Structures are given as structure tokens and as C-alpha cells.
Design a binder for this molecule. Structure first.
Ligand code: NA
Length: 129
């Protein structure tokens, strides 16, 4: 599913991301836009053989099981296909965990390079929240 901006904001808010680990909602919306273009089905293969899945491009080295990422972990205890669902529930749960791992949202390269230090509130402007 391809979310609309405000539709995703609302969904993220209901699943408890505004202001989670001190990250206001706009940070999360911004990260989704640039990681996936707001597509739940987005997959991207990396140079190490890992793959990034879903709206927040969660990576198979560490957080989910794809069966083709040898010596990898599965911290989130899920099949990476769970992260492509139209229900962003499992993505959000796993991302909590990620944003707890010590580097905060710097775990998302797109966030660091395109959202950090910007007016992230612009991503939720206009929305009924
Ligand atoms: Na894995």
C-alpha cells in the first residue's frame, strides 16, 4: 500500500510514535518518505547481501528473517515479509526497538541525511491529528 502523508501520520500516531524516544511525529513521517516513498512493499538489496524491507526499510542483517542473510540476527522476531504488510503494525513495533539500540534515528540513513535538523513539523502540517 502506498500511504498518503496524513494518513501515515495518523497511523503512526495511533501506534504510539509521536514523540517516542523523544522523536516527534514529523521525524517518523519524514523518514518513511525518504526511505520508501511511503510504499509498504518497498524492498532494496544491499552490498552486504542483506535486504531492507517496508515503509521504514528495516534491514535483514539484524532485525528480521529473510532466509538469505547468512549469519544474521532476527532481533525483531519476525519474517521480513511481515514488514511489507498494508498494516504497518509490525514495522512500527520493530522500529521501536531499533530506535532504542543506542543511536536513535541515526539508524536510518535517509533520516540522518535528509530529515535531521530540518523543519520536520512540515510533514504533519495540515493533518487532522
Ligand atoms: Na536476519
Amino acid at each position: 500500500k502506498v500511504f498518503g502523508r496524513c494518513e501515515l501520520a495518523a497511523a503512526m500516531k495511533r501506534h504510539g510514535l509521536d514523540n517516542y524516544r523523544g522523536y516527534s511525529l514529523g521525524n517518523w513521517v519524514c523518514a518513511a518518505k525518504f526511505e520508501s516513498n511511503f510504499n509498504t512493499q518497498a524492498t532494496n538489496r544491499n552490498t552486504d547481501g542483506s535486504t531492507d524491507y517496508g515503509i521504514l526499510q528495516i534491514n535483514s542483517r539484524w532485525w528480521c528473517n529473510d532466509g538469505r542473510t547468512p549469519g544474521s540476527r532476527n532481533l525483531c522476531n519476525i519474517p521480513c515479509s511481515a514488514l511489507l504488510s498494508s498494516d504497518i503494525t509490525a514495522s512500527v513495533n520493530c522500529a521501536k526497538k531499533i530506535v532504542s539500540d543506542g543511536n536513535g534515528m541515526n539508524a536510518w540513513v535517509a533520516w540522518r541525511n535528509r530529515c535531521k535538523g530540518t523543519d520536520v513539523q512540515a510533514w504533519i502540517r495540515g493533518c487532522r491529528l
